[PDB]
Design a protein around this motif. Structure first.
Motif, PDB file in Angstrom:
ATOM      1  N   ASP A   1       0.874  -1.240  -0.095  1.00 55.09           N
ATOM      2  CA  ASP A   1       0.047  -0.059  -0.014  1.00 55.09           C
ATOM      3  C   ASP A   1       0.982   1.233  -0.132  1.00 55.09           C
TER       4      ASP A   1
ATOM      5  N   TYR B   1       2.189   1.841  -3.505  1.00 56.75           N
ATOM      6  CA  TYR B   1       1.325   2.479  -4.386  1.00 56.75           C
ATOM      7  C   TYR B   1       1.174   3.774  -4.307  1.00 56.75           C
TER       8      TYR B   1
ATOM      9  N   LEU C   1      -1.457   4.549 -12.926  1.00 60.11           N
ATOM     10  CA  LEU C   1      -2.425   3.460 -12.693  1.00 60.11           C
ATOM     11  C   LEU C   1      -3.070   3.195 -13.773  1.00 60.11           C
TER      12      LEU C   1
ATOM     13  N   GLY D   1      -5.588  -2.023 -12.382  1.00 60.22           N
ATOM     14  CA  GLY D   1      -5.249  -1.846 -10.987  1.00 60.22           C
ATOM     15  C   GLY D   1      -3.796  -1.837 -10.851  1.00 60.22           C
ATOM     16  N   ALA D   2      -3.024  -2.199 -11.603  1.00 61.65           N
ATOM     17  CA  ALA D   2      -1.732  -2.202 -11.641  1.00 61.65           C
ATOM     18  C   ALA D   2      -0.833  -0.942 -12.112  1.00 61.65           C
TER      19      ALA D   2
ATOM     20  N   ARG E   1      -2.840  -7.142 -11.342  1.00 65.14           N
ATOM     21  CA  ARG E   1      -3.816  -6.190 -10.711  1.00 65.14           C
ATOM     22  C   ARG E   1      -2.879  -5.505  -9.740  1.00 65.14           C
ATOM     23  N   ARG E   2      -3.488  -4.712  -8.682  1.00 62.44           N
ATOM     24  CA  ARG E   2      -2.983  -3.892  -7.738  1.00 62.44           C
ATOM     25  C   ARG E   2      -1.584  -4.883  -7.082  1.00 62.44           C
ATOM     26  N   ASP E   3      -0.452  -4.313  -7.020  1.00 59.67           N
ATOM     27  CA  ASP E   3       0.846  -4.821  -6.634  1.00 59.67           C
ATOM     28  C   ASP E   3       1.442  -5.693  -7.808  1.00 59.67           C
TER      29      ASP E   3
END
Length: 527
Positions: free
Chosen positions: A24, A27, A43, A47-48, A299-301
């Motif tokens: 977190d 990001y 971004l 989500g990445a 995706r995120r991360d």
């Protein structure tokens, strides 16, 4: 951690340290509006975050240097010694101190990110690595790609190797120092440090420690392997080797076999371990239909590298305008069907060498002798429609020791495990058509269930390959590569061509006794 601990490395005037940042936090740092140039991230609608690495869109072997000193002089596979060409260029100790200084001065007076991590999933043989950067997404890259320590592991953390990323600096003195350019990727095995100057390519931060593990592990009897590896319900471990386009990823993806890893593994007394904590996957022409697992991991991360992001935040995965070598990294748990909670298992008992034989000479499956296993591991052959490619150990670029040293320790570990090696042609046969994915999957099934280790065989001439007389689930006619030619003579003409290619390629390994001895296990010309 503390500022004073970084002073040990030559860095001073530290502003603030961000130590083992959370995903977190990374990001938020990556979207910092004050970032400039290649520090910047955006971004995407998956989500990445996505970043750009400038002109370095791949590794820079011509800028790779290793200090030649008492530690390495008589152990390293040097570029300026022997038959085999390589990029392991010797570096003077004094030039090393200059390059180190450039990096530690660049990292002085800065806010720094420090990531402590492991290379190697087995605690008794893993390398503790400390990474230092001034760029949040570089810290993110190493958080993805190496093994992330628990809070309890960080309490006792003692680095074995330091990696300092100074991509923002260059070496103005490079020409008079006899170097290739103002950039540098330099290693010192006495100080146990890697330096990165000038190049922003993410892969330098993972493949540097691969190269160093490739030095340290075989010298202590541990095999290092550029392979995927997976494990069945009964705990049976298989390793898959193959150059690009041989089907390595597809054939090691199986709902019933958990993935240990996709890229680099070690093989010690306890079994096979992943070097890495994540995957650095190629994304050119990526689609959800063709590569659902990789796509789903974005995706995120995850961290996208050099992909085209449109003004609306969507990704054009087909666009190779900047580079065909677009990439994404993600921690390994973004893939569901993995070995967890630790990326390691027992000893491999099946070793699978994949090759796409554009000459249509090699059998769909052969069972190798121990000497043939060394020979074909060193050869690392594949072809395309036919131009051959040979790459030692299925990946010459990260070999720090002579290729034969890798072959010897691999077969030692195989023999102690009772492992059997197989050579599998996923390429072409005599009809000029590719062998079917259905046929190769059935071959992999038959290998992995042990049904070929003691099966009856006949011997293919010239290559002396043991071919099973029958194989459950595969058309027997396909097993002899001669059967797709108008006559055995028409196969022999191409087999002679290919045998000569192997023999010519192998000659550069015969400056060691291991390599010289293995000539007699290689392909034979017709006499």
């Amino acid at each position: 951690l503390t500022p004073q601990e970084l002073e040990a490395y030559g860095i001073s005037d530290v502003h603030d340290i961000v130590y083992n940042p959370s995903y977190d936090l990374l990001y938020q740092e990556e979207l910092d509006p004050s970032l400039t140039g290649y520090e910047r991230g955006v971004l995407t609608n998956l989500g990445a975050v996505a970043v750009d690495t400038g002109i370095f869109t791949g590794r820079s072997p011509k800028d790779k240097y290793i200090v030649r000193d008492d530690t390495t002089r008589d152990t390293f596979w040097w570029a300026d010694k022997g038959k085999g060409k390589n990029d392991n260029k010797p570096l003077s100790p004094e030039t090393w101190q200059h390059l180190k200084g450039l990096v530690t001065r660049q990292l002085s007076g800065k806010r720094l990110f420090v990531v402590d991590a492991f290379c190697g999933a087995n605690p008794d043989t893993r390398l503790s690595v400390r990474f230092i950067t001034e760029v949040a997404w570089q810290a993110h890259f190493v958080k993805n790609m190496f093994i992330r320590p628990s809070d309890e592991e960080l309490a006792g953390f003692k680095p074995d190797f330091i990696v300092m990323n100074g991509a923002k600096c260059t070496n103005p003195q490079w020409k008079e120092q006899g170097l290739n350019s103002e950039n540098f990727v330099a290693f010192n095995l006495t100080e146990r440090m890697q330096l990165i100057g000038g190049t922003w390519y993410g892969g330098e931060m993972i493949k540097g420690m691969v190269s160093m593990m490739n030095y340290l592990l075989p010298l202590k009897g541990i095999a290092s392997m550029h392979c995927s590896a997976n494990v069945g319900e009964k705990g049976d471990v298989a390793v898959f080797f193959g150059l690009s386009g041989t089907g390595k990823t597809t054939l090691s993806t199986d709902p019933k076999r958990r993935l240990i890893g996709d890229d680099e593994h070690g093989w010690d007394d306890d079994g096979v371990f992943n070097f890495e904590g994540g995957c650095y996957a190629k994304t050119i022409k990526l689609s959800k239909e063709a590569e659902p697992e990789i796509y789903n991991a974005i995706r995120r991360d995850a961290l996208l590298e050099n992909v085209t992001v449109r003004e609306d935040g969507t990704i054009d995965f087909d666009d190779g305008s900047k580079t065909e070598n677009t990439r994404v990294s993600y921690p390994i748990y973004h893939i569901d069907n993995i070995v967890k909670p630790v990326s390691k298992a027992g000893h491999a008992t099946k070793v699978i060498f994949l090759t796409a034989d554009a000459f249509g000479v090699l059998p769909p499956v052969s069972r190798l002798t121990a000497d043939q296993t060394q020979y074909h591991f060193l050869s690392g052959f594949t072809a395309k429609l036919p131009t051959p490619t040979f790459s030692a150990c299925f990946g010459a670029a990260f070999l720090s020791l002579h290729p034969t040293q890798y072959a010897e320790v691999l077969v030692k570990r195989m023999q102690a495990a009772g492992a059997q090696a197989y050579l599998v042609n996923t390429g072409w046969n005599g009809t000029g058509k590719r062998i079917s994915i259905k046929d190769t999957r059935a071959i992999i099934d038959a290998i992995l269930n042990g049904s070929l280790d003691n099966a009856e065989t006949f011997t293919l001439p010239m290559f002396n390959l043991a071919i099973p007389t029958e194989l459950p689930g595969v058309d027997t006619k396909i097993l002899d590569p001669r059967n797709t030619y108008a006559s055995p003579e028409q196969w022999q003409e191409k087999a002679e061509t290919l045998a000569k290619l192997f023999i010519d390629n192998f000659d550069k390994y015969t400056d060691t006794p291991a390599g010289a001895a293995l000539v007699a296990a290689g392909p034979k010309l017709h006499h």
